[PDB]
């Protein structure tokens, strides 16, 4: 009895060879994440056919041996940014998937700014599930935050020096109910560059115009007067920032701000979790305790090869709801260069502290099946990339981002 | 929420447009037969992907409006010879389909004898399910019964006058366990023609050589004793005959002989059921009672338009097992030219005679969903083609062959 | 020995069946226009592979019999707006082809404004011939004239009442040097609608901003002076207007304005040719003599079936160059509803008076081969759609627009 | 301006990724052989589309780095057995290409004897050029020499010990007139094995039955008289033998016998050229002088790395015509394990002595363009495989077989 990815790779016709190679790589990882939490084999068929139909044709070329073919530059390896199996209370697990949609010729003179890929993905995904992709907030924010093809081409002198010209990042929530849901993030770096204005105020003026044009409530001030201090702006780098939203009924979506910090102390980092003390609550401390715990847990160890750790790379993401005056944080510790053995150890014993034993077996099973390297190699660095925490009203939001393309790094 | 055929037609890439049109026609009928008895949705996906992968690329071109493109002539309409949901007691219904594999150019000077299609289907089907296609009996009988490409091409003067140059017919048992099983039938008409010998003789000499080479027991004497007579040979058409076998472990396969009769009375038809009285048992009359029952049932009615019925077109199929010394009959009433309303009424009230009500609702559901015409048109003749009967050790074997391409006849 | 379209339809794999059917229809007409003026056979292969690769996947679905599958509404039949072999002196004939790029789902809730198709066509066409698609003027005018997806979706209440929501029309000059050249036209109807401003104003303000941003000289005053009047605006329909440009080195492109008139006398039509007397020269009357000639020629005849002709449907296109201060007209007589026999006779004897005998045989050859109907049917109306005239510095610019899908209308 | 293979790889859709990789490898070599003797560009398109359509889908999988995926074993590397530009006087050079058609699953339990690939290639090739593939001699010899699928499967115990189970080899003469011509060779090793009879006997009995059934004259006596001896049979390997024929009008085809020898002196090799003195003429010694010439030429050098040469691997091919009573030889020196620099030098100075200067530049051009390695690496062994000689009624038949997949060996 074959598995859905095996059978499908046997029977399916692929438009392009690179889609076949991406299938061989990803489809096992994806299928095992789906089949190691219980995605009904039919739903596996459905999501794998969406992956075969919508996202892989919108992934860009496959990394060859010297990644000679990768022409759309990035500080990350080619392919997905992550595969985002997340665990919450009551054994509710779900599979998520982030990709910066890359055209087959993005980063080349035929598609210098990678303009179509995101829209082709959106359109294909709406055609697959009609009525499932509401385009309101996309319509409102694409003018203010993003930059279309022609505007980027007229002002190429302004943004050429930028290394990563990323403007649209799409995350798929592959619901267990076969009803995949799109999420879009806009980094305004090219916008703030050509307009020569600060990231802060373009982001917040966009959210403000949306607030008034929509009438919906998005409390956005506290983020602003924190991210606009100077002690903050000395430690973070504001230009690794974006804000995001769900392509849904704008009465249901959210607006998440997101930025990056290189911090020395966990106390120092408490600012980002707290927006400088402004954003404080009975749960703002619940979450920060756990993140500091896992912080010194995974930073207790040494780097592979005795190289010294000077600072610690964290990422941060707040979100603002439409119906209430609330905004909540979500912290990441970047672990791209640690011991996969140590990272896995910290993950599993943190889980054990939570008592997430079902999730523990889930994690180890997904590990062994989807990522053999962590056992075949004692010195291993390539499974995990980010360990993300966030406490919400009834539980933490710990997501273990992976590189489903780690097999290419071995 | 789409259905597997809808979603799949949306996402699947088709190698050829004719495969797409055949999909649009068949896949609803096939999928509704599958989902109208309970084929689990992932099993539906599997069988529909087999149909998409194995059988549709081996079905030949799609009938256009004047059927101008059909170059592989036949007395039947293009497409499957039947789609043949079978019913047995204990609510045991299963789906099976018959096709004369036609190459995309069969019946043209590039493939004048349609040689490859069957082997390509066999090979593809074994590649899909390895170890699931045993080729023993095929290997033994392809030399004696069938005719390869080169032999048929050397002796074209001999068989050119034949209208239907059919030599290999493949039936798929689309098991509910996703494990489709191939069946092959060989009509020796071209063989008996070029060799200028009697059908009876080549058929039974082939089965005899297999009996000795294999040691297995295939009692074939009584069939020969009956089919060799003259009172039989005056009424039946001996040239619409084949023998069949399952591509399986030859310790598990069977050998079925098959022929056709134009009979006047049911009494005179009792011969074929009984091989002239030789083949007799407690069940030989059980099945005959029921076939006479439905015989006078569906023949009591008139033909559409007052055309007179002179005789009755029946088919017959005897079967010989390996482990024992037994041979059993299975009769067919052809209903290609009758009232779909009357044919349906006879089916439902015969079934309702068995008490097969679950099967009754099953039949009417498959009717309304897969065949709207029987209601949209009071005068309708195009759903059913054959009503087949056979009584085995426990229950009857009533199979309601349809034309899944009836919609093409509207 | 096959022909390129025959051989290619034999060997090529098509991504979609509709591309195959469009191939069967168009590829003969296109290939016969190419091979009926002398397009070298490998150049035929190249252009036919471009048509197979770039334009047919961007043509939208194929008209089925009741044309249910056409969801992107229009006052014209589906397919190209024309196939437009143009003739000039010295036996200089070239092939060109207009299409309103339609997405496979344009006019449906997945692509309500047909946004991507034009950009996908542009991108594919640049990928095929790198460095051959300069995007300057597209970049400048896409903001001012056209409407993107999100803007059109936010203001759907404004433009929903419009019947034809056409915003981008692409013409391919299939050069005999295998170097196809793209041309883009923008009708500002949706823009002028949502902005609730006059077509004249947005068009000329866009050209003015381009004049200042680029420094190049596009004399646009006289066109505005004439189109702004009222005696003009009572007879012409101002909303069937666009302006166009070549995707090239903007030091080489042009800007053509374009509109449509329902005129009673040729005298009263002289205005559009002359912009009310402002646009006058030695050639302004040269071209007008010839258009009045063919006007009374093809209007002297009656309509098929005795229906009366009240007015005459003409189109007009003025052009402004960059290096100089000039603007030149080009008139059209619509012949969609006339006798193909009469239309053909007028074309051939116009040519004969002009002495274009080589062009005469060219025309009749393309007729018989690509359009059999004009002979198979004495009463035929379906070959030609537009007879366009323009006299430039040396010779006339008579282009005989056809419907390469006329066979679909039979 | 691209080249046909570049443009085509850009525009063509490939059914399988392996076809794309084989395209990337072969299509440059094939196209440069075509365009380095003058194959007209549209003829290049035609042959490259045949290679894209007929032969590459019938080439088997592409060698990955460890070559795990070649499941059809062989003593040669995967891909064509050669790419075999042939040179004759009057600057008459033509391209031809040999392949053992391998199914995508040949050598696996779904296709253990690689039965279909040759017939699929034949059928496809006839469908492309109807009337261009006469199947007479194939029909006559497929029973006597070859072994079908079922016969090979019944007697698997007999031929399992054989390493190379090759039974059908197809050579394409890619005529400069776009009219490719098929050639088929049958090695009877599996036949002579299962029948347990001598190769000589089955081969010549087959040719004899064809002689009587057809009436045509194929003088085969002297070959049998020589190959039946013992002094011959001690030095030559009789099991690397086949006989071949053209799929054409059997009044035009030929029958070539073919075998292989490991010979010590050129004197002792003169036997195979001469069938032991029986086959003698004015040209029998003409060709032998030249082969001894190039023999001592390319064997005077040493092997790369000082390994000693004990004997010399030669191949031989005699040919029998239909209209006359003649049989002519054609010898081969295998150079698989020599200095590409030395092999090339011998080829070019042989040519130079022959005065084939145009052919000299042709050879060096094809070398540099299609095979860079011979210059990038001073120690190179991988361009050439066979240097074949034969002197016919006017000039020699020197064919320089290459490995068009040499780049895979780097
Ligand atoms: C918006 C995309 C591009 C990145 C964010 S993915 P996420 O898992 O952080 O989203 P949620 O926290 O689950 O709401
Ligand atoms: C052998 C094929 C080509 C036709 C016979 S199909 P069948 O339904 O009669 O086979 P069974 O009676 O079910 O065993
Ligand atoms: C701009 C496109 C969409 C329509 C105009 S095509 P055309 O033949 O009128 O262009 P030219 O007159 O040849 O310059
Ligand atoms: C018959 C095939 C499989 C191999 C022989 S190819 P060839 O070049 O030796 O054929 P010719 O000598 O040119 O006639």
Q: Which candidate in D2, D6, D7 is best for mutational testing of the C interface (most C CBs within 10 A)?
A: D7
DSSP state of D236: E
Contact D21 A17 (CB under 8 A): yes
**Hey, whose CA ends up nearest to atom 4 of ligand 2?**
B171
C11·D42 Cβ contact <8 A: no
CA dist C242 → A71, C159, C188, C252, D267 (Å): 38, 17, 6, 20, 87
Residue D398 tokens, joined: 């020197």
DSSP-derived secondary structure letter, C138: H
What is the Å distance from ligand 4's center to D330 Cα?
10
d(CA D207, CA D250): 12
Q: Which residues of B touch A11 (CB under 8 A)?
A: 49-50, 52-53, 128
| Shortest Cα–Cα distance, B310 to chain D (Å) | 46
What ranges do the domains of chain A cover? 4-409
CB contact under 8 A, D110 and B123: yes
Give A117's contacts (C-beta < 8 A, 6+ positions apart): A58, A60, A101, A102, A103, A106, A111
D280 SS3 class: coil
State the DSSP H helix or E strand holding residue C361, giving kind and residue range, or none if neither. helix C357-370
Longest CA span, chain B: 61
Residues B74 and B164: beta-carbon distance below 8 Å: yes
Quote the minimal CA–CA distance from A137 to chain D in Å: 37
Q: Is A26 in the pocket of ligand 1 (CB under 6 A)?
A: no
Measured in degrees and rounded to the nearest 5, phi and psi for residue D316 equal -150, 145
Tell whether the torsion through CA atoms of C256, C258, C264 and C268 is positive or negative. negative
**Distance, CA of D175 to CA of D111 (rounded, Å):** 32
Q: Contact A206/A141 with Cβ under 8 angstroms?
A: yes
Q: Mutation test of the interface with chain A: which of D10, D15, D16, D17, choosing the one with the most A Cβ atoms within 10 A?
A: D17
Instruction: Chain D: list its partners (3+ Cβ pairs within 8 Å).
Output: A, B, C
Task: Please list the alpha-helical segments (H only) found in B301-356.
Answer: 340-354
- Please choose from D81, D169, D244 the residue to mutate so as to test ligand 4's pocket, defined by most ligand atoms within 8 A of CB: D244
Query: This structure's resolution (angstroms)?
Result: 2.9
CA dihedral D193, D196, D197, D199 (to 10 degrees): 10
**E strands in D12-110:** 82-83, 86-88, 92-99
- The position carrying tokens 């699947």 is B12
Q: Would the CB of A169 count as within 6 Å of ligand 1?
A: yes
Please measure the distance between the N-terminal and C-terminal CA atoms of chain B and give it in whole angstroms.
Answer: 29
Burial (CB count within 10 angstroms: exposed 0-12, middle 13-18, buried 19+), residue B226: buried
Q: Cα separations (Å) of A96 from A33, A183, A393, B42, D389?
A: 10, 10, 21, 22, 65
Q: Under a CB-based contact definition with an 8 Å cutoff, are residues C79 and C409 in contact?
A: no
The 8-class DSSP code of residue D141 comes to: H
8 Å CB contact between B218 and B229: no
A149 touches chain C (CB under 8 A): yes
Which CA distances in Å does C404 have to A194, C62, C87, C382, C397? 46, 13, 17, 10, 21
Residue nearest to atom 5 of ligand 2 (CA): B171
Give residue A3 CA to ligand 1 midpoint distance, Å. 29
Which of these, B189, B208, B182, lies nearest to B320 by C-alpha position?
B208
What residue has token string 């996703």? B178
Cβ(B320)–Cβ(B309) below 8 Å: no
Subunit contact B7:A127, Cβ cutoff 8 A: no
Nearest CA to ligand 4 atom 4: D171
The rounded distance, in Å, linking the Cα atoms of C248 and C137 is 8
* Method of elucidation: cryo-EM
What's the full length of chain B, in residues? 410
What would you report as the CA-atom Rg of chain A, rounded to the nearest whole angstrom? Answer: 21
Categorise residue C67: left if φ over 0, alpha if ψ from -120 to 50, beta otherwise: left
Q: Which residue has the tokens 């995926």?
A: D69
Where on the phi/psi map is residue B196: left (φ > 0), alpha (ψ -120 to 50), or beta? left
Q: Do D17 and A15 touch (CB under 8 A)?
A: no
Cβ(A203)–Cβ(A188) under 8 Å?
Answer: yes
The number of the ligand 3 atom at minimal distance from the alpha carbon of C96 is: 8
Distance CA C348, CA C364 (A): 8
- Return the exposure string of D314-335: e unless at least 16 CB atoms fall within 10 Å of the residue's CB, then b: bbbbbbbbbeeeebbbbbbbbb
Q: Cα–Cα distance between C16 and C53 in angstroms, integer? A: 12
List alpha helices for D93-188, DSSP H: 116-128, 136-144, 149-154, 156-159
Query: Crossing angle for the helix pair C357-370 and C340-354, nearest 10 degrees?
Result: 160
What are the structure tokens assigned to B104, written together? 């995309």
Q: What is the Cα–Cα distance from A244 to A171, expressed in whole angstroms?
A: 10
Atom of ligand 2 nearest to the CA of B254: 14
Length of chain C: 410
Half-sphere exposure in the Cβ direction for A17 (13 Å, CA): 17
Given CB atoms, is C148 within the 8 Å cutoff of chain A? yes
What the block records as the tokens of B377 is 């048109």
Question: Is the CB–ligand 3 distance for residue C120 below 6 Å?
Answer: no
Query: What is the three-class DSSP state of D240?
Result: strand
In total, chain D counts a number of residues equal to 410
**Radius of gyration over alpha carbons of chain D, in Å?**
21
Within 8 A of C11 by CB-CB distance, chain D residues are 49-50, 52-53, 128
Nearest neighbour of C150 by CB, restricted to A15, A116, A143: A143
Dihedral class, residue B67 (left if φ above 0, else alpha if ψ from -120 to 50, else beta): left
DSSP C307-348: PPP-SEEEEEEEEE-SSSS-EE--EEEE-TTS-HHHHHHHHH
Asked if D41 reaches chain C (Cβ–Cβ under 8 Å), the answer is yes
Question: Do residues B381 and B77 touch, judged by C-beta distance below 8 A?
Answer: no
Q: How far apart are CA A185 and CA A101, in angstroms?
A: 12
B128: number of CA atoms within 13 Å, CB side?
A: 25
Q: Where are the alpha helices (DSSP H) in D155-281?
A: 156-159, 189-194, 199-214, 221-227, 231-235, 266-274
In chain A, the largest separation of any two C-alpha atoms, in whole Å, equals 61
Contacts of A155 (CB under 8 A, 6+ apart): A194
Look-up of token digits 């009263």 = C268
**Contact call for D105 and B115, based on CB within 8 A:** no
Q: Which long-range contacts (CB under 8 A, 24 or more apart) does B26-29 make?
A: B26/B51, B26/B56, B26/B79, B26/B80, B26/B83, B26/B404, B26/B405, B27/B51, B27/B52, B28/B370, B29/B83, B29/B370, B29/B371, B29/B402, B29/B404
Exposed/middle/buried for residue A215 (C-beta within 10 Å: 0-12, 13-18, 19+): exposed
Task: Give which of B158, B284, B43 is closest to A7, Cα–Cα.
Answer: B43
- Confirm or reject contact between D17 and chain B (CB < 8 A): no
No. of H helices and E strands in chain B? 16, 12
**CB within 8 Å: A131 and C109:** yes
Chain breaks in chain A (C to N over 2.5 A) after: none
Across the interface, do B17 and C14 touch by the CB < 8 Å criterion? yes
**What is the distance between the alpha carbons of residues C135 and C250, in angstroms, rounded to a whole number?**
9
Supply φ then ψ for residue D348, to 5 degrees.
-70, -35
DSSP, collapsed to helix, strand or coil, labels residue C259 as strand
Residue A330 has a CB neighbour count (10 Å cut-off) of: 21
What's the gap in Å between C317 CA and the centre of ligand 3?
9
Residue with tokens 């309103």: C100
Rounded to whole angstroms, the maximal C-alpha distance in chain C is 61
Ligand 1 centroid–CA A171 distance in Å is 7
D259 Cα to the center of ligand 4, angstroms: 13
Decide if D109 contacts B116 (C-beta within 8 A): no
Does the beta-carbon distance from A15 to D13 stay under 8 Å?
Answer: yes
Angle between helix D4-11 and D41-50 (nearest 10): 50
Residue partners of A19: CB distance under 8 A and separation at least 6? A52, A56, A57
Helices within D66-188 (DSSP H only): 116-128, 136-144, 149-154, 156-159
What is the C-alpha to C-alpha distance for residues D9 and C127, in angstroms, rounded to an integer? 12
In Å, what is the CA distance from D212 to each residue of D140, D206, D244, D318? Answer: 12, 10, 18, 21
């Amino acid at each position: 009895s074959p598995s859905p990815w095996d059978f499908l790779g046997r029977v399916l016709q692929f438009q392009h060879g690179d889609h076949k190679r991406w299938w061989d790589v990803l489809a096992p990882v994806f299928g095992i994440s789906m089949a190691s939490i219980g995605y009904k084999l039919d739903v596996q068929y459905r999501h794998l056919l969406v992956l075969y139909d919508a996202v892989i044709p919108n992934m860009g070329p496959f990394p060859n041996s010297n990644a000679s073919n990768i022409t759309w530059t990035s500080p990350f390896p080619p392919g997905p940014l992550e595969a985002s199996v997340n665990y919450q209370a009551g054994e509710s697990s779900m599979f998520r998937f982030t990709i910066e949609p890359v055209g087959p010729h993005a980063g080349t003179p035929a598609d210098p700014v990678n303009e179509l890929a995101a829209k082709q993905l959106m359109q294909r995904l709406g055609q697959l599930q009609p009525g499932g992709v509401d385009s309101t907030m996309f319509d409102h924010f694409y003018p203010l935050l993003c930059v279309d093809g022609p505007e980027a081409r007229r002002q190429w002198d302004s943004i050429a020096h930028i290394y990563h010209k990323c403007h649209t990042v799409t995350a798929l929530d592959m619901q267990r109910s076969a009803a995949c849901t799109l999420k879009t993030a806009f980094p305004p770096l090219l916008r703030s560059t050509i307009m020569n204005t600060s990231m802060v105020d373009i982001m917040f003026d966009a959210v403000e115009s949306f607030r008034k044009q929509s009438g919906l409530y998005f409390d956005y001030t506290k983020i602003k007067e924190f991210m606009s201090e100077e002690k903050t702006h000395e430690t973070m780098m504001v230009d690794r920032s974006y804000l995001s939203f769900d392509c849904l009924d704008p009465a249901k979506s959210r607006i998440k701000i997101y930025t990056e910090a290189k911090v020395k102390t966990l106390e120092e980092a408490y600012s980002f979790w707290s927006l400088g003390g402004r954003l404080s609550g009975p749960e703002i401390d619940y979450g920060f305790k756990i993140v500091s715990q896992m912080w010194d847990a995974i930073y207790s160890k040494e780097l592979p090869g005795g190289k010294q750790r000077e600072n610690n790379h964290i990422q941060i993401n707040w979100e603002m709801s439409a119906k209430d005056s609330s905004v909540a944080p979500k912290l990441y510790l970047t672990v791209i260069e640690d011991y996969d053995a140590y990272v896995s150890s910290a993950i599993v014993d943190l889980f054990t502290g939570l008592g997430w034993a079902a999730h523990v077996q889930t994690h180890k099973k997904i590990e062994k099946e989807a990522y053999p390297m962590c056992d075949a190699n004692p010195q291993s660095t390539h499974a995990y990339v980010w360990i993300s925490l966030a406490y919400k009203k009834t539980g933490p939001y710990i997501t273990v981002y992976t590189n489903p393309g780690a097999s290419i790094l071995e």
